[model samples]
Structure formats: C-alpha cells, structure tokens
Target chain A: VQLVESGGGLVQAGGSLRLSCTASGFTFDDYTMGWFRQAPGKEREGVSYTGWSGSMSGSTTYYTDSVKGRFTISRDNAKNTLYLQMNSLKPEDTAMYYCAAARYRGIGSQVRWTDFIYWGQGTQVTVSS
Target chain B: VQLVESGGGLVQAGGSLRLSCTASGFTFDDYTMGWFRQAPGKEREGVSYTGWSGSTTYYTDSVKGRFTISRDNAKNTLYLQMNSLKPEDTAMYYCAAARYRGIGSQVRWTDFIYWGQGTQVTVSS
Candidate 1:
C-alpha cells in the first residue's frame, strides 16, 4: 500500500491544512490507522487515531500545558485514506510525519491486540516560511 | 497512570514462548495498547495489539508463525511473548498506546506518544 499526499505542500500558520496517506496493498477494513510525529532528536509520538468513516478521536489526551490550537485526524475507508490536519501551526510544528496501521480484535471472547505494521517513509513538513 | 510489570524472564528454543509488559500509570481500560520489537540494528517492528482485558492481535503476517502478545487490564499490564526465540528476538521490547478515538472529526495527533521505558531481553541461552 502506498501513502499519497494531498493538496500542495504549502501550509500557513493559523490556517487549515489536510495531508493524507492512502493504502492500496491490503484490505482497509481489517486494519486501524493512526498518526505519529518525530521531531529532530525526539522519539515517535502518537498524534491521533483516524476512524474508518473519516472521523478523528483522541485529542484531549494530547493537549498539554505547553501548546494549543486546532488539530484533527480523519480517514476514508472507501478510499483507504488517512489524514492529519492542523488549524493553527507554529514554529514548533515542523517535524517528520508518519502514518501507521494497527491490528485490533473486534468484539469477541477471543483476545485481540493491534500492531503498527506499515509506515509511510514519512513526509517532512516545515511549519516555517 | 501506572503500567505494572509482569512475567519473570525465561529461555526456550528458537521456537515459541511468551513475554508481556503491562501498564499502570493510566487507566488501562481507556487506552489501546500495542507491542513493538527493536532488533539490534533494525527499526522497531510492529508485533501485536493487546486489548483491555488481555488479548492480542498481530500486524505482521509472519508474526502468526512465531510471536504472541496478551494483556490484563485488571492488572494494568500488557505482554509480548515470542514463540521461537531467534537471534532476531534479541532486542528491546516496548509497549505503547493509541488514544481512544471518540465521536469527533477534529484530530490532535501528538508524537512516541507514551512508551514503557522498555524491556531488554537477550536471546543468548
């Protein structure tokens, strides 16, 4: 599966932007999609969880006392697409972007767990002009 | 907000055995946990997913033939068990979470997010 980019590669601070990664090699239904960020010298960080219907979740758990603004995640099961959008970007927003797939066990007596199987080589976005 | 530790270390053939890492620092019930393997010189490979109670789901196709992961939410812990301990199993094991997605379209995506300092397992018998 390949992760494709959407829109031009230029996003302004305080403006809304959408970036996506589309998977084509496997069935999107059986997998879960999530986003992660890697700053210069920092480890990978979980950003948000994207749903099958293009909806986003898990933001409040991320908001720290350090920074705040509009940021969201969404997915398109039909197109096998995962997205990450930031409304107000700051200088600190510059970093490497990665998209991942998680394995989950749906409702059942059987136990289930998810792993990040695939990763986009990564998209480097500089939040600075 | 605590991730409790579990299972004593042991050795087995280059075939199959179980190891686990549980969480405690946070409400284990509210988050989705996963397992990762960092081989000596390789990047982390996604191994499996552990549920709130103690279940596992694997991402790698090859994982089905060897590794396994489980958890116990009541105990706030997650696990990673390798069936056939190969030289490849020699690395650090980490457990992390994917925040629960709620009814919203807006995304806050953050970064390693949270990690278990990690478990060091050597494959030398």
Candidate 2:
C-alpha cells in the first residue's frame, strides 16, 4: 500500500494548509486514519507543534484541543485518500506534514486502540508572503 | 505545554541515540504511550510500547535490549534511549503517543495519532 501527500508545496499567508494523502494498493474505506504535523527548527517541549493526532472514520473527527479551529480533516472513500486543511496560514505553519494510517482494534466498548502500520511520505507546506 | 520532540542527532554504532519527547497538556498512564521509528522510505515501526495502566509496555524483539522506553511523568515526558545504534537505524526517530482515550464508558487506544516532527538520528562516526 502507498500513501502520497500533496497540495502543500507553497501556500499564501492566511490561506489554508491544504494537504492530502492518497492511499493505494489497499482498501480505502476499511481503515481509520490519523493526521500529524512537524514544524521546522523544532525542539524538545516543542512537540506540541507536531503532535496533533486528529483521527477520522467518517464525518466525526477527534483532534487536539490546542489545534481547535485551526484545521479540518476529511477523506475520500472512493478515491482512497485522506485530507488535512488548516487555514489562517501562519508563516510558521510552513513545515512537513504527514498522515498515518493506523489500525484500530476496539480495546473496551467505546474507543479503539490506534497504531500506525503505514505512514505517508509527507508534504511540505511553505507559507509565503 | 504539548508534546514536543527534540531535534535529530548523530551517534556511533556503539553509542546511543537519545530521543526525548516532552508533553504537558495531558494525563499519562500505563496506556503504553511512547516512541517510534519512521525510517526513510519505510513503514512506521513501534520501538517502545506503553500500555494504559500507569506505565505498561514492551519493546520490539529487535530492540528490546537496545530501544528502551521511559518517561518522567513528573516532568511529563517520554524517552527512548536506543543503544547499539546501527547504520540502518540512522533514520528519523520520533517521540509518539499510544495513549488510551475515553468517550464515556467506551475506551480506545490511540496509536501514532500524535507524533513529534522527527528526530533524524544517524549511526555513524
């Protein structure tokens, strides 16, 4: 299976970090997915800049509270692709962003256990004036 | 504070690649939250595993002895000290989470949903 990310080459300020991850060689609608990010010149205690695991199965999404109102997540079951978008592009939003396809087996009766079996190569979002 | 991964580093075969991830916004448990390796052009692999019980985890068979998972709940951080670094291990290692979540009585384990950028570690010189 393959996941190729796109639409993050260069974006205008105050725009959206429109990134997409297209998965091939596997069932598109059968798996749950997670979205992550990585800002440049990063450091320890700065992981917050990257650790936004917003997982989606359908219309509902679960992402970091800190990133609330920052981005939106969606998928194309027919196209076998997942998408991440964050508008109000800060100059610092320019970095490598990735999406991971994690397998989730229900642990209890509610949520499921998530683990990355496959990862997308990542797309660079460069915010320019 | 949220989860943050350290910048990458270079190490020798006999030395260790010390990767650390610090977090402050969430409560951690034995939920098996920890670190992983995202090598160049490879699938994401789990190096250390932490369970949701307070601190319960294991290591990959290849690195049970080399890649160890640790944390400073007091400091709110997750640590992975990979000894015997190898050339193949010279990829981007990352600080990650496998925390358990709750939506009422229902519970689910979150995998690499959250990961630090990537600590590019090398095993040379």
Candidate 3:
C-alpha cells in the first residue's frame, strides 16, 4: 500500500548513483514501476524508462533519448523493489527522484500503459560532492 | 512564463470542488495540461487526466473516478473538478503543462515543463 524509497546523497560529477524503492502491501510483479524527477524550482518529469523485471515477452521498456545509455530501471520481484541507477552524474542531475507504480493493459504495440497510480515521497540527491 | 493556479477552500464532505490553472507565456492549446496533488502527509500523485486540444483525454486510477480535467483553449486555462468529496480528498493540487519531446522515431514522451504554485483544499463538516 506504500512505497519506501531510499538512496541519495552527495555524489561527485562523473560518478554514479543508485536509488531504491521498496513496495509493501501489493504483489511487486503485478505492476510496472517507473521513476520521475523534479529539480529545484523546476517542473516534474518522468525518468528515462519504465518496465517490470523478468523475461516476459511483453515486459518491454521505453526510454527517453536524453537519459538513454546513462540511466537504467530494474526490479527485484523477490524483494518487491524497483531501482534507478545513473552514471556520469552532473550538476544538472541533481534533483528529487520519485518512484511510482502503475498497471497497464495489453502488450507490446497494443499495450496501454497508464499513468502512475502510486508514488513515493521522493529522495533528494545532489550532484556536487 | 508561469502557471497560476487558483480555487481551493473549505468544502463540506459530499460537496464538490473545482480548481483552475491559468497558463501564461505559452500556447495553451498546443500542450497537454495535468493536475497532481499531495495530501497533507502523503506522496504526490497525478489526478486522473492529461491532454491537449482534440486528443482523447487520458485518465488514471488515482482518483475515485470523481475527478475530471478540462481546458479553455481560448482562455489559456485548465480546470479540475471533483465530486463526492471526502476527508481523504483534502490535498494541495498543482497544475502543470506537458512538453512532448520526441525521443526517437515518431514517438514522444510527455514531460511536465511548467508547474503552478498549487492550491490547497480542505474537506470538512
């Protein structure tokens, strides 16, 4: 019924960062989890990608060009957790990161991904060490 | 240059509430607008809708199917209305305009480009 997010702290530019969002009160594999972020004094935006773990044919992920190659979203069904990891962090990467849970319909091209239904309180990370 | 949101006050449970977000310095009709809210002590969540002119508005399961989002193309404004109010409905609602950027191919991702200061609503009595 809730998501407890953790991981975030001062990191030097060019370094990497990893964050976690642990879910409780629901079957972790039943939903597709994603990451979103908001910078100081800026609007919120979705992270680079979203998807579930495992090798399901329909378990596809979509990535935004900006964060492509640098950001990765993964999951551990056993732990009921989702993760966000990014490398080559820069000043612009400093922001508050939030993890969200969603349920979608269909698969692949016909798949209809809905908006995030549940969100975490967010973890703030700074990119200047 | 900004999104100024208004409308939020004490509303009795079972009553309805309407909120507004006025867009400035942008072509309102060209962008999809959405509402996200945070309860007094909860994480932020999207209301239930997001869309631009002439598109099928998108909705989520965030609200109890009582929320609706609309726009005034001519007035550069967006609105959110909710009925069957309850105590859990109390929250600080924020409005934001979506910026659809092409990631690759012909596909695009919706990113919130502009946000409002938010309006607080309290359900009671």
Candidate 4:
C-alpha cells in the first residue's frame, strides 16, 4: 500500500514540520481521511480531519486553533494525498502516529463514527536527539 | 474542561457480552456515539456503530455476528457487547463522537469527540 509522510525528519522546536501519506494499494479517492496521535501510555488523539468530494479533485481539511501553534493538517484531492504539519516540536509531541479513513453515515448527512481501520506503521519522533 | 466519559469494563471467555460508555455534564441528546478497540501496539479498530438513537449497530464484515451494540439515550450511554469473546477481545475500548462536516468546497467535518479514557477488556476466565 502507498502511504505518505514527511520526506525528512523534523528538528526540535524548529520552524514547522510537514508529513504526508498517500495510498496506492487501493483507490482512496472517495474515502474520508483523518489523523491521530498516541502519546506514551496514552490513547489515540483525533488531531485533524478531511474527506473526499466524490471527485478526484475534491478534498477536505480539519484544523483546530488549540493545536494550530504546533499542528496543522491538509490534503490534495487530485493526488490522493494527506499531510500533517507540526511546529515548535516539544517532548510532549513524541508519540506513535497514524492516518486513517473516515466513515460516513448511510445518508451522508452525518459522518459515521468509527475508529481508524487502516493505519500507518506509525512514525515515532523524539524531541531529544 | 474536558472530561473522559464513563463506561463499564468486561471480562469473558469465548462467550458473548456487551460494554458501554455514557457521557454526563453535557448535552449528549443530539450527539453521536461510537465504540473502538485498541490492541497492544496497534492503533485502533472501528468495531461497532450506534447513533443518537442510542440503538445498537454493527460494522459490515468488520465485526462478527456474535458482537452487538446498544445505547441508552436517556442516560447518554453507548455500548459494545460481544457474543463470542476471544483472545482478540483483550484490548482497550473507547467511545467517540461523529463530528458534523461543514458545507461547501472548503468545509471540514469534525466530531465533538471525547474518549472514555478506555476500558481494558480481558477475555480470561
């Protein structure tokens, strides 16, 4: 399967870090996507959100001001890719990471509430060298 | 302040069962509830489905028929009851919200989402 990530690693408390995950094994053009984080000895955190537009050119983005100082999420519809950006990395930011598909209710009015079914092996970033 | 909801814990051996998570101190009457399972070192799995009606629903093919779900709207609760508990049922269980997506090309969908802190269910004697 084709997953996306930051081409390189991030520096501690540096500028900003960007990571991406692209799917290739299957057609994810029509799937909703999300990002999650699992801190040491903690459960997963729903960081960001996005969804497919039913077209190869449609995409969605989810962001929170609370996390804006250190996190951001984006995606490209045509390329079928997802991106996660982190800023001013801290020791608290160290955790296993995952990207997943979002589910929608039958009528599409409300997104289906579900846990991440597909996930990345997880990227571990340590604040300390 | 963010409060981790409340839910019951479970332990069974190769049998059927159900567990639940209920939210308090908030208006859960219009909120959607979900159930999740986290295996050791693994991320999480979407095990079952239930909406505001607080009724039981299942994920197609993902969940075995032996597993069932239910919710008490009055009590603002969500549940996951498995019929044939196996070693696989030994994992952390969680409940989340189904966020509403915005409108238009730039719209983003987010869930009110609160975890139950997690209920560790071990399928043992």
Candidate 5:
C-alpha cells in the first residue's frame, strides 16, 4: 500500500522550523501537496480547514489567515518529500498537521475530480518555551 | 454539511460487509463520496474507497483496488464493499465529500467540508 508519513515534536514561540512528509510507492507528479490540521478536541477549537500549495497549472489553494502568511508548502520533486514550514510559531499552532496528496481524474475533459488518496501519519507540533 | 458512516462492528474472516455514508446539505450528484482508514499507529490510507465504474474516481493500491464505492441516487447514500476481510483490515474508517465552488475552468476542489463520525470494523476468526 502507498503511504504518507509526517514528522513531529516541540518548538518554542517565535521560532521557525520545517515539518516533513515523505511519500512512497506512488507517482508524486500526479498529486497535489496538501495540509489538514485538527485541534485537541471539539473541546472548543474544532474548526477544521484544508490548505494546499498549488503546483499544478490551474490548481487552486485557499488558506486561513492563521497560516496564510507564515506557512509554506514545498516538495523536493526527486526525493519524494513534502514540507510544511512554519514561521513565528505559537502555542495555538500546537496541533496535528498532516501532509496529503489526493488522486484526480478528469470529469468533463477540462475539469478534474479529486479525492483523498494519501495522508501522512501526521506530525504533532507543540509550541512551548 | 454532514455524513453518516455505518457498518458492522465485526465480521468473520473471509466474509463481506458494506459501510454506508449518507450525506445531507448538498446534492449527492454534485460530488463524489470518498472513504479513508487509519489503523492504530498507521498512517491514514486515503485510497480505501474510490468511485463507481463509468465515473472519474481513481484507485491507489492493492486492497483498495479491490474495494468498491457506489451510491443510490434516491437515498443519497454511498456504500463501501469489503469482499474478503482479513485481520489486518481492522481500522477506523471515515467517509468524506469534496466541496466545489465557482464555474467551469473556475471550478475548484475546496476540500472535504463534511465528514462522518468514524466507524470500526474487526475481522476475526
């Protein structure tokens, strides 16, 4: 089976670092590198959103302000690595961040229909002193 | 946006079971129902469920290549087929739907807005 594996750990506020997701057993060119974050609990911070670093022509990506300006998604095309780099980390950024790649096929010749095909093990980042 | 994931809790090895995903708040025909799974300690495999024949859904790997995804338009529910169950098949499965907006060429993959409460399946002897 194909897999998406992510990295995790601790960081301090105001520091910047890179999180990675390594993909294997699949074609990296066909999928879009995406991200998904889930908080501790419905337990108050339960709003979920999906974001991506669009690389494919005409591909679209939308992000929340919390990450739009500070997060960057990049992939090393030959090494099969997808990275999510964060800047000015905060306790609020402490959560599970995922690396994702979904498969897509053409629906109306010009439009593409896509769906979840792979998600990393998930990296839990905790911002602290 | 809402989704219902329903399936049997346990199934004897070598047997078959179907999981259901019922959606609300959007027209079922406008999007496709997707399925994914996470075994304890294992990364989530997003290919657990793909699409029906004559459609655009794409399959990823071995087991999932054998899995099936179909829907009944009248009920607006999606189904997952596990034909030959195995112990390794045990996992928490989820159902999701992709959201889209704008028009042709402008149409976009907005992400899965609705997800089903997870369901578990155990394949034992």
Candidate 6:
C-alpha cells in the first residue's frame, strides 16, 4: 500500500491551510491515519492521528499540545483519504508535511499500541507575506 | 527527561518480540517518543515514533517493512514490535524522547533530547 499526499504551498501568515493524503492498495478504514512534519534543518514533529477500534465501536483523535487549538485531523474511510487542517498560520508552521498509515497490535486492550506502517513522500508548506 | 528501554534478548528465528521504553521526569504523553536500532556494525536507524498521533519512520531496508514503534502512555512507556525474527535483526535498540528548543524569540525547533541505555537482542535458531 502507498500514500499520496497533496496540498500546502506559499500562503500568507494568518491564513488557513488544508493538507490531504490519499491511500491505495489497502482498506483505509482498516488502519489509523496520522500526520507529521519536518522543517529544514530541524527535527520532525508528530502532528496528529485518528484511530478507530476494530469494531468501529469508536474512534479518537490525538493532537500534540503545539497544534491543539488550531489543527484538525480527519479522514474519509470510504475514499481511502486522510486530511490535516490548520488555522492562524505562523512561519513556524512552514515545513514538509507527511501523511502516515498505522497498524495496531497486542494481545489485549491493556497493552495495545499503534505502529506506523506507511508514509507519503511529502508536501511542502510555506508561510509567507 | 529520561528514557529507559527494556525487553530484548535471545529469541528464536520465526518468532515475534516486543521491546519497551519507559519515561520519567516529564509528562509521558506530552512529547514524541521514538525508537532506534544499530546492528553489530551498522549505522543507527530510526525505527518508529509515537506522539502526534503515534507515528514512526523506519530507516533500515530490512525493517522498513514491518518493524513497529509504538507506545503505552499510561505506563509511561514506548514500544518496538517485530515479527518473524531473523539473525540479521539482532541489534542494540534505543529509545528517545523528542522535545522543542528555542533558538531565539521566534524560532522554535524540536529534536530528541534524551536516550535510553539500549536493549540488546540476538536472534538465533
């Protein structure tokens, strides 16, 4: 399976942005989807992830404190698509955004955790003006 | 902040294994925790990372396909999961915690700041 990411470009400060990743070769709803970003000469950042239980009984979204108030992570399981949206952009947000797929495993609910299995090449986002 | 890794050792080929890293001195869920590995004489490769929604980026070709780096926040620990082990998979695995650093009043950069002592694993038939 592979992930194709798109969106992000030169946008003025304070503008809003939306980034997306489309999945192929696998059932989208079967895996969790997340987003990450790496700035030039800086370390990578884990942006967010949306997870679903096996039974689809529920799904949850987790975000880092850094992006909580202004960032949103979503997906279209039927379309095999994942997305990231951000508002009140700052130059600090400029970076190469990556979309990822994760697989979950463990014997019981007490120890289950998710592992990232696939990633997109990248989509560059720059804040200017 | 400190990361202490554990759970690696002798394992038979064709078996599965899981490694863990526990965090202390900081809120475990606040930052990204990652795993790295180095074979007997190879460069260190990033295996996986959790936080920002639990993600990872593997670097080694052999593990790029199935090595899993995940975490257990409630236990203040990170994990590394591997299946169908082989001899080439033997290595010293490490865990790291990622935090942000301020370069000035406006530039904030993030990176791994602490590392574990490493758990050594040997796969044999």
Residue B62 of model 3, lDDT score: 47
Interface RMSD of each: 12.7, 7.2, 9.5, 8.4, 10.5, 14.0
Q: Going through the candidates in order, what fraction of the true interface contacts does each contain?
A: 0.00, 0.05, 0.00, 0.00, 0.00, 0.00
Q: Ten residues in a row with the worst lDDT in model 4 chain A?
A: A104-113
Question: A30-97 in candidate 6: lDDT tens per residue?
Answer: 67788988654334568888876545476767888878899999899788888888898988888778
The CAPRI quality class of candidate 6 comes to incorrect
For residues B12-62, could you state the per-residue lDDT of candidate 2 as single tens digits?
Answer: 478765677877576664344666776666887766666552434677787
List the DockQ of the predictions in order.
Answer: 0.02, 0.06, 0.04, 0.03, 0.03, 0.03
Comparing 1 and 3 by DockQ, which wins? 3
Residue pairs with backbone atoms closer than 3 Å in model 3 (clashes): none
Candidate 1, residues A1-129, lDDT tens digits: the string is 665555325566655566788886878755667766655423456666543332232221232232344666666778888777776776677666677776553343221123566666666666765
Deviation from native of the Cα of residue B5 in model 2, angstroms: 13
CA shift of B25, model 6, Å: 32
What TM-score does model 3 achieve against the real structure? 0.49
The candidate 6 chain B region of ten consecutive residues with least summed lDDT is B101-110
In terms of docking quality, model 4 is: incorrect
- Assign candidate 5 its CAPRI class: incorrect
Q: What range of 10 consecutive residues in model 5 chain B has the weakest lDDT sum?
A: B101-110
Off by over 4 Å in 2: A41-60, A107-114, B1-125
How displaced is residue A33 in candidate 5, in Å?
Answer: 1.8
Residue-wise lDDT of candidate 6 within B1-125, one digit each (tens)? 66777777555688878887878889887776777777755888766665552333434577776677776778887778888888888778888877633422221123776788887776643
Off by over 4 Å in 1: A5-12, A52-69, A106-114, B1-125
* Higher-ranked by DockQ: 2 or 5: 2
Predicted structure 4: lDDT: 0.61
Per residue, candidate 5 scores C-alpha lDDT tens digits across A12-122 of: 889887877777788775565666665542111211222223333354444567776887767676987777778888788876666666665444332222355566556
Off by more than 4 A, model 6? A53-56, A107-114, B1-125
Q: What is the iRMSD in Å for candidate 3?
A: 9.5
